[PDB]
RNA sequence: GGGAUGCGUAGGAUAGGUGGGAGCCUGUGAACCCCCGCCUCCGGGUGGGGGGGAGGCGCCGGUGAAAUACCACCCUUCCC
């Protein structure tokens, strides 16, 4: 068959014609999650934007009230006293020039990269073509560059997420784990949707949230009413 | 409503986009063989069937701008 027996059994638990409330979705995706790990819960939105024009990009960050439910390995690149600041703030790795070389030679065992602005000339130039095509190059709009590197690191450790519409006009994010209490998933979902609506482009035509689904890593989708 | 389609070069080879992913599939029948329709960039791909009877795939590494299982929302080019 096109799917395995685990997946096939899940399919009957979702009504394809029903649009669930967020509360119903939060409860349901915990029944759906069946893989042998703590499946990541996801939200997908089909946006009423024109992804061909830069003034209708939907890009941003948000801290979920209850975070991400996974460790985030953070690499910090810094100088001066920021180095030890990054360290005591709990960055998994902290370094300078030599850290840059290490990455530049193929080291990638980290989940996020953050930097002080006074290494970004070097990081940008040398690591741009390496971290770029993988969405890891630090950026102060994404809240990953700045001299308060302690706060950035903690913000990210505490699972602050990014969202960026794809070129087809859909957007996607992780919003929690299927092991979370349902009310805490609901909170994270509403928090993410609230952030998307905060970034609705001024000139976007039509309904902004054309479709919104909740799913988890390995299971079917649940279509939801974003305004519930 | 339903069904297909996604290949420069390098690379197992047919890598549409992004997000999730460290697991996934398998006597609820793996690999493999065989037949037919469709598609094809003529490499193969894809959907279904006739057999088979125990493992196959991913991750890591490698190539690459991008990495592959599995899952989600989409988009392209089409056809009932």
């Amino acid at each position: 068959p096109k799917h395995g027996k685990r997946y096939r059994a899940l399919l009957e638990k979702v009504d394809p014609n029903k649009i669930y409330t967020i509360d119903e979705a939060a409860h349901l995706v915990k029944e759906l999650a069946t893989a042998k790990f703590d499946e990541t819960v996801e939200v997908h939105a089909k946006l009423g934007i024109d992804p061909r024009r830069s003034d209708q990009n939907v890009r941003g960050t948000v801290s979920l009230p209850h975070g991400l439910g996974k460790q985030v390995r953070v690499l910090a690149i810094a100088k001066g006293e920021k180095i030890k600041e990054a360290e005591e703030a709990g960055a998994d790795y902290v370094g300078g020039e030599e850290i840059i070389q290490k990455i530049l030679d193929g080291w990638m065992d980290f989940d996020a990269v953050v930097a002080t602005p006074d290494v970004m000339g070097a990081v940008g130039s040398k690591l741009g073509r390496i971290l770029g095509p993988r969405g890891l190059l630090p950026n102060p709009k994404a809240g990953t560059v700045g001299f308060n590197i302690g706060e950035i690191i903690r913000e990210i450790k505490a699972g602050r997420i990014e969202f960026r519409n794809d070129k087809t006009g859909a957007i996607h994010a992780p919003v929690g784990k299927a092991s979370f209490p349902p009310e805490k998933l609901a909170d994270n979902i509403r928090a993410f949707i609230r952030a998307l609506e905060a970034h609705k482009p001024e000139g976007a035509k039509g309904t902004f949230l054309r479709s919104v689904y909740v799913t988890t890593t390995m299971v079917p989708s649940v279509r939801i009413n974003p305004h519930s």
Side-chain angles (χ1 to χ4, degrees):
Chain A
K2 145 169 103 149
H3 304 275
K5 56 182 194 274
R6 181 196 57 87
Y7 183 87
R8 283 179 336 242
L10 303 178
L11 227 37
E12 70 217 15
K13 300 181 165 193
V14 195
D15 180 344
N17 297 287
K18 168 172 174 103
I19 293 189
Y20 296 75
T21 68
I22 289 167
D23 281 348
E24 288 167 346
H27 284 84
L28 189 59
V29 284
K30 307 163 68 52
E31 311 173 32
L32 290 177
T34 36
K36 303 182 179 162
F37 55 103
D38 202 348
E39 299 194 31
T40 297
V41 177
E42 317 164 20
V43 170
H44 303 260
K46 183 175 69 196
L47 302 180
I49 65 171
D50 182 355
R52 296 165 304 191
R53 38 192 302 165
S54 300
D55 63 354
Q56 294 191 20
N57 289 349
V58 169
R59 302 176 179 184
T61 60
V62 64
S63 283
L64 311 167
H66 309 294
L68 266 177
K70 73 183 294 161
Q71 74 168 259
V72 182
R73 291 165 301 162
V74 178
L75 192 162
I77 307 172
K79 293 176 179 177
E81 293 180 300
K82 300 331 306 203
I83 305 184
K84 135 123 152 263
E85 194 199 41
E87 283 163 328
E88 223 85 28
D92 296 75
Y93 320 107
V94 177
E97 313 182 28
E98 200 67 44
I99 268 286
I100 287 157
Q101 255 295 150
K102 189 176 186 61
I103 300 167
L104 185 51
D105 283 334
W107 183 54
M108 290 280 326
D109 299 285
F110 43 80
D111 298 307
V113 187
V114 302
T116 43
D118 56 7
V119 302
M120 277 307 301
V123 168
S125 163
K126 267 108 112 61
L127 297 184
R129 35 222 305 119
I130 307 289
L131 299 189
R134 296 158 193 284
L136 291 169
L137 189 59
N139 186 340
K141 302 299 183 181
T144 47
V145 176
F147 288 106
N148 59 336
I149 205 75
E151 295 162 37
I152 281 178
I153 291 167
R154 275 188 304 270
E155 282 198 21
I156 280 180
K157 286 310 215 127
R160 173 183 113 310
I161 62 182
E162 60 177 288
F163 49 88
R164 174 192 197 204
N165 70 281
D166 61 45
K167 73 165 124 124
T168 79
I171 199 157
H172 324 281
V175 297
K177 286 290 182 176
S179 69
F180 283 11
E183 65 275 16
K184 287 183 156 198
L185 269 187
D187 293 348
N188 277 13
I189 294 165
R190 293 179 185 118
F192 171 63
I193 291 168
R194 173 183 200 205
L196 290 177
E197 290 174 312
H199 290 71
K200 175 186 175 170
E202 187 283 325
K205 181 192 295 190
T207 301
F208 179 56
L209 299 180
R210 300 283 175 103
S211 77
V212 185
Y213 288 87
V214 178
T215 193
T216 82
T217 305
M218 305 288 186
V219 311
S221 60
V222 186
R223 181 162 176 185
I224 57 152
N225 171 8
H227 301 125
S228 66

